[PDB]
Amino acid sequence: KLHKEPATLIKAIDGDTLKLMYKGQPMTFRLLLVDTPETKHPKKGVEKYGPEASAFTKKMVENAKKVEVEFDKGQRTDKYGRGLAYIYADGKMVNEALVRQGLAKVAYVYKPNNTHEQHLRKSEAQAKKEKLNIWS
Numbered sequence: 609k610l611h612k613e614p615a616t617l618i619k620a621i622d623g624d625t626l627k628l629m630y631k632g633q634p635m636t637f638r639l640l641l642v643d644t645p646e647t648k649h650p651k652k653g654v655e656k657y658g659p660e661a662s663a664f665t666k667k668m669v670e671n672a673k674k675v676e677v678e679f680d681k682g683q684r685t686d687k688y689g690r691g692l693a694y695i696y697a698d699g700k701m702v703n704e705a706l707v708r709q710g711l712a713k714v715a716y717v718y719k720p721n722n723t724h725e726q727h728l729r730k731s732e733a734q735a736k737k738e739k740l741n742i743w744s
Contacts, residue, residue: 610723612676612696617669622648623661623706626669630677630691637691639665639703640680640721641728642712645742657742661711665702672697682721694724707731710740 616629623644626637645655647662669675678694685691695702704724706712708731717725736743 610678610680610694612678615675615677615695617672617675620662620666620669622646623658623665623712625690626665626695628675628677628691635691636689637677637693637695638686639706640692640694641715641717641725642703642706643715644706644712657711660741661706664706664709664711668697668700668702668705669695674698680721680723682718692721704728704731708735710735710738710742710744713742 613630618627618629618634620626621636623646624639624642628635628637644661645658647654647658649655649658674697676696677691678696680692680694683692701724703712704727707714707728714725714728714732735741
């Protein structure tokens with residue numbers, strides 16, 4: 609069963625990337641299963657809704673009493689040494705909130721790291737129906 613472990617925000621870097629203190633180590637985390645528009649993007653620079661996605665993650669996590677990380681059951685770090693996880697701000701999953709607000713798309717999913725894929729997909733369908741942000 610997946611379980612939550614506490615973490616301390618160091619710095620929000622982008623819509624989908626954060627630096628956290630995890631078990632005494634500063635580490636970069638990449639939000640599992642979501643692609644947000646980018647500000648630090650390799651070739652196009654600032655994509656549309658990039659700044660908004662980034663402000664949302666920043667606010668959500670900065671304003672939280674408690675931040676927790678949830679590892680899936682596959683690999684826990686990617687080729688760049690970033691943590692792969694579901695991030696919770698006061699019990700609320702950041703990855704899903706971004707999708708529900710139309711500020712992220714569900715990513716190409718890699719088994720076995722896909723436990724909350726259906727949940728997220730259901731939030732994505734909804735945001736699209738509501739024609740929010742990315743979907744407007």
